[PDB]
Motif scaffolding. Structure first.
Motif, short mmCIF file in Angstrom:
data_model
loop_
_atom_site.label_atom_id
_atom_site.label_comp_id
_atom_site.label_asym_id
_atom_site.label_seq_id
_atom_site.Cartn_x
_atom_site.Cartn_y
_atom_site.Cartn_z
N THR A 36 23.99 7.39 78.13
CA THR A 36 24.57 8.49 77.37
C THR A 36 26.02 8.75 77.73
O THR A 36 26.62 9.65 77.12
N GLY A 37 26.61 7.98 78.64
CA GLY A 37 28.02 8.05 78.95
C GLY A 37 28.88 6.96 78.35
O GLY A 37 30.06 6.88 78.69
N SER A 38 28.36 6.14 77.46
CA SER A 38 29.19 5.16 76.76
C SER A 38 28.60 4.93 75.38
O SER A 38 27.53 5.45 75.05
N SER A 39 29.29 4.12 74.58
CA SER A 39 28.99 4.06 73.15
C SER A 39 28.99 2.65 72.59
O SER A 39 29.17 2.47 71.37
N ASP A 40 28.77 1.64 73.43
CA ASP A 40 28.66 0.26 73.00
C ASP A 40 27.26 -0.23 73.29
O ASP A 40 26.68 0.09 74.34
N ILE A 77 35.16 -3.38 77.44
CA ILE A 77 34.85 -2.08 78.01
C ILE A 77 34.99 -2.14 79.52
O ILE A 77 34.73 -3.17 80.16
N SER A 78 35.45 -1.03 80.09
CA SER A 78 35.51 -0.85 81.54
C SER A 78 34.83 0.46 81.87
O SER A 78 35.14 1.50 81.27
N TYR A 79 33.90 0.42 82.81
CA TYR A 79 33.10 1.57 83.16
C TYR A 79 33.67 2.29 84.37
O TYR A 79 34.51 1.77 85.10
N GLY A 80 33.18 3.51 84.59
CA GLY A 80 33.69 4.34 85.67
C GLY A 80 33.54 3.71 87.04
O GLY A 80 34.30 4.05 87.96
N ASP A 81 32.58 2.81 87.20
CA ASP A 81 32.33 2.15 88.48
C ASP A 81 33.18 0.90 88.68
O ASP A 81 33.00 0.21 89.68
#
Length: 330
Positions: A36-40, A77-81
């Protein structure tokens, strides 16, 4: 329509949860991390660099009679981690728990970062944040939920994550047998593309509730609970021997400790996270230093109600014209 799918922890720590998803015709079932924190919606695929695949199940669009290349479309995409992935895009039929979307953008990875390769249990991600965050270029694509919304009995999905146990993602209905008491709804800001809301405060263990506004996001794709340094310091101060370790990367505590609960406010309601949910076990095999499940957000830029918090609740993601979040105890 509705859908209902079981979500299962990938390991004994509940580091993430995987949900089976049917892609293509005939179906290819991949186990995706609903986020629920990303959209791909992206998958390991027959196009993924071979050295970057290590045990994952792959999507092969050439074997799907309903797959169509989305000409010219790419994603990255690049994630918070710090992890990342990128590739090209197909449209195909995607089903979750009996709910089917045709023409869903399925983002096929050509490259994935090492953390994805090293996790053989996660075959990709299914994003459930707002479609404004989708990374497909030059034509942004809709999430699975956005595509399904109009067909659903009600424009909602719910997350019921288990503690050391399977749980459920439902689409289109609210299972009134899955929670206790009532659901408290709270306002959402979509300005950053997240399910962003404001908690009304917190308590540590049996301590008094501190009324204070804590803006953050409901993020099923983040393992831990990331909160302001003041709040996190107050929590760990109640655990003898706990300390923040720069070398480990956060708060650690003696594995012999019994952890206090942590309560967060949702309006006038309260969600209690049991202490055991905050234990993420030895920092390395055999260590007597354990990693905490509540950590500071100070270096993130946003507070994150990740799985540690969400698994203590039945959570309603209400995608009506004005979205809201609901939390119930369970």
């Amino acid at each position: 329509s509705t859908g209902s799918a079981t979500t299962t922890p990938i390991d004994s720590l509940d580091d993430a949860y995987i949900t089976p998803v049917q892609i293509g015709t005939p179906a290819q079932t991949l186990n995706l991390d609903f986020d629920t924190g990303s959209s791909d919606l992206w998958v390991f695929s027959s196009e993924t660099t071979a050295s970057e695949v290590d045990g994952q199940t792959i999507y092969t669009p050439s074997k799907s009679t309903t797959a169509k290349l989305l000409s010219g479309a790419t994603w990255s995409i690049s994630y918070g981690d710090g992890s990342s992935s990128s590739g090209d895009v197909y449209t195909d039929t995607v089903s979750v728990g009996g709910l089917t979307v045709t023409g869903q953008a399925v983002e096929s990875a050509k490259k994935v970062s090492s953390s994805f390769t090293e996790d053989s249990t996660i075959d990709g991600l299914l994003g459930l944040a707002f479609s404004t965050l989708n990374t497909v270029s030059p034509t942004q694509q809709k999430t699975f939920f956005d595509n399904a919304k109009a067909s659903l009995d009600s424009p909602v999905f719910t997350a019921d994550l288990g503690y050391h146990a399977p749980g459920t993602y439902n689409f289109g209905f609210i299972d009134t047998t899955a929670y206790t008491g009532s659901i408290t709804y709270t306002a959402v800001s979509t300005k950053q593309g997240f399910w962003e809301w404001t908690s009304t405060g917190y308590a540590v263990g049996s301590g008094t509730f501190k009324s204070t506004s804590i803006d953050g996001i409901a993020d099923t794709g983040t393992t831990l609970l990331y909160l302001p340094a003041t709040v996190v310091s107050a929590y760990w101060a109640q655990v003898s021997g706990a300390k923040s370790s720069s070398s480990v990367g956060g708060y650690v505590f003696p594995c012999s400790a019994t952890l206090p609960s942590f309560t967060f406010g949702v309006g006038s309601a309260r969600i209690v996270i049991p202490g055991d949910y905050i234990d993420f076990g030895p920092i390395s095999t055999g260590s007597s230093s354990c990693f905490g499940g509540i950590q500071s957000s100070a270096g993130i830029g946003i507070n994150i109600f990740g799985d540690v918090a969400l698994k203590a609740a039945f959570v309603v993601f209400n995608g009506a014209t004005t979205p809201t979040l609901g939390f119930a105890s369970k």
